[PDB]
Design an enzyme around this catalytic site. Structure first.
Site, PDB file in Angstrom:
ATOM      1  N   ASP A   1      18.908  52.795 127.535  1.00 42.71           N
ATOM      2  CA  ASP A   1      18.267  52.871 126.200  1.00 42.71           C
ATOM      3  C   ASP A   1      19.122  52.615 125.076  1.00 42.71           C
ATOM      4  O   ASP A   1      19.801  53.397 124.823  1.00 42.71           O
ATOM      5  CB  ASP A   1      17.792  54.340 126.173  1.00 42.71           C
ATOM      6  CG  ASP A   1      17.205  55.134 125.076  1.00 42.71           C
ATOM      7  OD1 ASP A   1      17.263  56.295 125.058  1.00 42.71           O
ATOM      8  OD2 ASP A   1      16.577  54.615 124.217  1.00 42.71           O
TER       9      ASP A   1
ATOM     10  N   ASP B   1      15.343  49.483 119.832  1.00 42.22           N
ATOM     11  CA  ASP B   1      15.104  50.435 120.969  1.00 42.22           C
ATOM     12  C   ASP B   1      14.444  50.007 122.333  1.00 42.22           C
ATOM     13  O   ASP B   1      13.331  49.847 122.314  1.00 42.22           O
ATOM     14  CB  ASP B   1      14.186  51.634 120.554  1.00 42.22           C
ATOM     15  CG  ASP B   1      14.026  52.939 121.314  1.00 42.22           C
ATOM     16  OD1 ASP B   1      14.921  53.325 121.832  1.00 42.22           O
ATOM     17  OD2 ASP B   1      12.853  53.685 121.317  1.00 42.22           O
TER      18      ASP B   1
END
Ligand code: C47
Lengths: 333, 333, 333, 331, 331, 331
Positions: free
Chosen positions: B219, B35
């Protein structure tokens, strides 16, 4: 008085019908179901933990961002047919439809995901009486009628079918542009509760059930028309549907052929044709269609009672009478 | 330095992309999403109660079975776009891709089922900066770069389409065997956050939105491409999709015909063709296809921001630059 | 002794099989799975909070409405393959099949929604031994056999296929009207646990797995036939299915063609034909059919073990021997 | 030391297109890459919105494009199902990561049929110059002169109904085939056609004994044959023409022969699977086959044309050094 | 100052019915409202359960009804697909919120075909008296005399496959149309038919140049034509009769002409969309069109009849003051 | 005091098979139980993998079986759709919970068609010895001599598209029928055929007035007739042969006659439901009927054969004491 007002609602899958109110000064805007089945107002709090996933997903009320809040603090737990929400009491001004009142409402800090993770709305506005108000907190309706402003102590609901207008409430009246023929009223059985006497249910053509009089709570904040498990089961058995855990269902070829069901309220007969009850998104021998009637057991507070929700109001425009305590029905157009 | 490394990831429904790391000596093996949208490492604990059903379902970390653990104890709560996990801090050695570092990470003892009961992965590895690290705990990347070992302070992601390789990160570099043409970099807007300036979104052929510059967080740990509800709604309205509670959807016959959407980042234009955005498992007039764009509101910490997740990286191989703070894009092959 | 008895069960989706017992004097009636995989009795409490939504949805036990209750109070937490329920101990009379015993059981006040919101049953009746009884509380079976009444210390299960009879247990015997040929018994591997030696699994025609002997817990309270992730995975790979998070699945055209799987228990071979394992509600190239085998890891208490649940018993009528500790199989008819 | 793959879309197994940018900044469109022709064409803004086909598809807007370079020489492009007419222009087309300058056509007249059915906007020819209408230098030739590709080769991969397919200009990607290729040589430069020595339905060389021609078209969906050879074949498959398309019954699917295209001295086999479109196994329903007659004209045609159907089978490599085509099993 | 809408059900785009109550307290049934006829009929208890059609549909039970008023004059009602025979009776029928007393028929002989396919129980005619069998005063006429409606008008709205449709007796509901209507005048009172001046398939007036007739039927599903004009048209659509119904291929759908009904001096256009039934875009499957020949007899017929197909298109207003019909786009 | 039921699989209503074990330890296979023949056959390892049919189906492997007992006398088994050829062997076959020793055949030549469509591996005949190829004593006869069954009877139950069906060897299971049976007597021992006195489509005895024959086959899917009587019938159903199979329209389904097989002096009726395959009620689609012509040869055939279609209707009991067949409604 001489104001009349309506909120305008959004219809979601014919299963969930919400309008908007504004708490607080600057208003916080929340989406809500206008419920005659209870009497309390609540919305989610900012103080709710986000480990409850429903609070991550709905708007929260921050009151330290509200000039007009007013601290309270008692705990309050709401139990319903189908989930509990727990939280605490607060006061601020709430605006429903251009009418502003200062209402005592609950800030929920515990919000169960099931069902609330599936709700498109944020909270609830009970349209019920003081009587069924947990914490014996005055309800919006009683407060608006204090304000001396409505021409009548009546509110009415229009629920639409689905895909303009999703619905509409009108405070202090009834829009005659959405009903026809006349209204027909059934007086409230006890009072401080929207319960009416109900004389029999016909499936097809005979009283299979309800037969020595029963109770019919008329509830706007309910989606389905339901009864006790025990007579649900039975009606079901007739019509010919299975049980899938929470709803019955019929094969859809069978679909456009289930008989009509009738509801005998005050010397009139409310009938629902098969399409008004089945959620037909197929007509296919291989696929399952569920119906808009369910089992629900509501405890002796008020239940056992049949509950008439959206299924029903969507066919019959309903007005709820305050002045006179009764309910009237007329045909939605 | 002169080491380069990659983890290799598994692609799940194009919606969830995980690789493996090993905590502890004997390694405990957990599956994780890498992430860039956060900066913390956590995995589930053994100390988590199994009355949380997600902990019954993922592997847990037992540290009293780890020779190299090291007690910490501060509480730490992680809030994300879409669930909270809460837990406590610990240290042990973590191995990502043949590189071993001793990292301070969280042991989660509260793990919300929704969404986590639907996650195929066990935890998360934030690839974010110290800045966005709750508890101001150093992040794996900063630690690996301490180790003096990479030839570059860069990591890159390759996300694949689906049904060999599901993806691939490479630490200290970029495999040129999975991109083409050149890379194009957009420098980071502030720093301590993967946010870039974004100049406009075109649906079809005109700027319907983003129009006076906006933010685009890039992201990896996000599956969909999303924006605020308010411009989501609007884009949506154009393209022609409904709302199903959490995603929009189009009828699938309509499917292979939604226009292209464009993302204007640094004098280049990132366009996504209709297939790159719709999850077409039908072409049928009667069935609903959902799209790979969503609404998500991320709060002023960093949002409002559009988030570019998997939808996007899957088309453009992305490299994230440390040395120089910027992001570069190139076409995945 | 000379009583024989059966409860009669309801079959739900072939995935959940429950009968009825009555706790308390006036009986409270709850629906329950008769489980050989554990040894404890529990039902939900009235004292459970309704903020747990599963308690809003199942019947609860009120004991202050029970003339014959008897207070206990120790806490007790039940962990299973697949959820925890926590609660406290109590005693009252429980009636299973016309046999009345006073049993110590748990009142659950914590009931996890996932999975329990999807359970049609209310609790569980472990048919296991004292040995695996959390809290070392005697189990119903041991108590009924105290009563001196059965002609044999045997109970047997019949699970039916689906859409009369959903199943049937018989206490003190076996109805020969639902099996054929003879029975074949495998003696219990240790004792105080329904575990049997299992000699090999054949998919198709060869031992792909189980190969140097393994464990097979025979569990009635389980729906699927499962094994460790690691040999599940492998079997899977052969047969040709994907993973959908919790189950494997095959395309249904492929469906009626997966090979047979065999289970080698005591010099006999239990084979299951492809239809006995796949849940075929299509035969279509475009649609996914899931299979009735799964992964489940049960920890060294007793697992790793393969678990033979409903999949299996539904084909082979099973009798569980007390007198002699062993299990016997025969072909359901 | 280059190579450039382009990712393909599969619409129903019947069309596979991918993308291109014409212009600066690039205006991007869905193109089909064909071995069938040699010209590049996308629809034009100058296309009248009278033609639905032009109303519904993306249009090239020339001055929205700085490199635009006018030409206006009128083109008509007659394929074997479809004439579109338009005019020559210039610009840079970027394909994969290559960036080329080519002469493409801006179509201004599109037939609704076939085109209101195409899902992509145009066509890119991978054919020779000899077959270009205007003797307009095509895009692979233009590209092969920048010096950059790694080989005078370009391959194709097309998925079964995920990715879809890929072109790899410059070479092959092994990730998608198994085995080593075998080439079968160009019967004469100019066209991507070879000689086929016998189509053997089922067991014995039924048809085309005694050679014939097969064009290899990346831009056709089926394996085509002429009308009557198609007749003969099918008659043998046991299918019957329904209305439009030939049909066989779901059930009956799995029981049909295999056809094997004898070619290059190696037999290229397909099966029932391979050629039948199984939306069911229902004995209760009818199934289409992916082989269709297509009579195409005298120099090119009459010929067999091995389309998406055959390509889905064997991964293809078109080779310009050697003016030969290779085939390995697709994987 | 009244108006009365009635909400309609759409079964497959092929039937739209809604409800009525005959009796006191009212016995409620699914009726189709038709511009096609002029008589009201529901099935009778006196219907023998020998006729499945009567076994499966709701029956009117006369003494379960206080206003019942015997008559027994035998009726036969021959439509253009279906004779049902029965007997005259009396009662109050409540339609919308109106409450009228009419003479309806209690059918006692129902054909399985077509009726074991009807999903509603009867028919309500919105046609003139001249066309009533028995010269039995119909329900709009009877209603138009209570003085209550706001206008000698009644409109129709029918949905695409939600609501379904609505009748608004007395006027129109704007919520369902866009624009302002244009009327086209009754070729002669008695029938809801007009004169149509040319059916132009695709581009040029193909057929009916030189007028012809179109009845406007709320009770038919398709746009009908006579057999051969249907032939001519279809031939032009490029469809072919399969077995029953004409067909075109999914793919091919979107490519078909537009038909435009020249009428009233304005051209009323429908498209492929509008007339084709798209259960797919599959090049792999066949699609039905919603236009069907229907030869109906010499005074009424021979004529075109614009059915649910056309009504789904243009919202309709039937107007009795002016004995004219208006059309606006349906919305 | 025995009985032995065997549980059946229903694949599409067109095949119902169940299982057997040949060998020790038993090698288990999917068999169809037929009243159509008298021989037991499963595929052989010795089957060449040249035959797909043998490649895809389970093979009997004789030495993997201790009771194997060689014989090798060559068999050919010609059914009325399918010859398979193979060789006689021995072993123990366990059926239900019975355990018998029989002579079965190991097939080594399987036709792709029909067999690459069968989903089970073989066939078990429940027919007489007279009809066995090899006059090889069949399995019910062999079984009926162990002394164990409770009655020289064996019944069948087959589900609509759950269980599937069951055979109950030795008797009947009441759980699956309603009523009391009526037998209708064997026209002559040797074959499971009776005499039928009239097939009456719809209302009046249309066909077969004046007797004819109906074999009762547990191993056929349809009700078969000869080609032309099938023609006559269908013509009457209002169906038309499409390509393969006859068809009627979904809509039209529910409106069709009933056929009633006059037999044994009682009329055995089926309906539209009963014989039509309703994958829809769509007026927009075509539906197959479950009755198919089947001309079978001179001693046996020409005859009607009441297949899964009729058996799905009436539960059947074949009775060997009395060489009669009973029928009760299936439930
Ligand atoms: C304690 C005060 C409440 C006591 N009485 C009740 O709970 C009564 C009988 C039921 C109460 O009115 C119900 N209808 C109100 C609620 C909000 C609980 C109904 C309800 O849960 N829903 C109705 C919403 C709805 O039906 O809108 C029409 C739909 C819905 C979606 C997701 C979660 C909940 C939800």
């Amino acid at each position: 008085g001489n104001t009349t007002s309506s909120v305008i609602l959004t219809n979601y899958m014919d299963t969930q019908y919400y309008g908007e109110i504004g708490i607080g000064t600057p208003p916080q805007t929340f989406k809500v179901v206008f419920d005659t089945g209870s009497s309390n107002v609540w919305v989610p709090s900012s103080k709710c933990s986000r480990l409850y996933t429903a609070c991550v997903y709905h708007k929260l009320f921050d009151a330290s961002d509200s000039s007009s809040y007013k601290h309270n603090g008692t705990e309050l737990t709401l139990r319903y047919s189908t989930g509990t929400v727990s939280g605490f009491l607060s006061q601020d001004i709430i605006t429903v439809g251009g009418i502003t009142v200062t209402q005592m409402f609950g800030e929920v800090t515990e919000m169960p995901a099931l069902p609330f993770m599936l709700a498109e709305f944020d909270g609830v506005v009970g349209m019920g009486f003081i009587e069924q108000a947990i914490g014996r907190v005055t309800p919006i309706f009683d407060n608006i009628i204090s304000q001396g402003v409505l021409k009548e102590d009546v509110f009415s609901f229009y629920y639409n079918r689905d895909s303009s207008l999703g619905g509409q409430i009108v405070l202090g009246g009834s829009d005659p542009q959405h009903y026809e023929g006349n209204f027909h009223y059934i007086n409230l059985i006890k009072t401080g509760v929207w319960q009416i006497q109900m004389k029999g249910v016909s499936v097809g053509s005979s009283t299979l059930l309800c037969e020595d009089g029963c109770l019919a709570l008329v509830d706007t904040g309910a989606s389905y028309i339901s009864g006790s498990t025990s007579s649900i089961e039975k009606l079901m058995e007739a019509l010919g549907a299975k049980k899938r855990l929470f709803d019955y269902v019929v094969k859809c070829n069978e679909g456009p052929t289930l008989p009509d069901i009738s509801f005998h309220l005050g010397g009139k007969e409310y009938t629902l044709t098969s399409a008004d009850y089945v959620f037909q998104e197929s007509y296919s021998s291989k696929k399952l269609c569920t119906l808009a009637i369910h089992a629900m057991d509501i405890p002796p507070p008020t239940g056992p009672t049949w509950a008439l929700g959206a299924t029903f109001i969507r066919k019959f425009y309903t007005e709820f009478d305050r002045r006179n305590n009764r309910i009237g029905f007329a045909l939605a157009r």
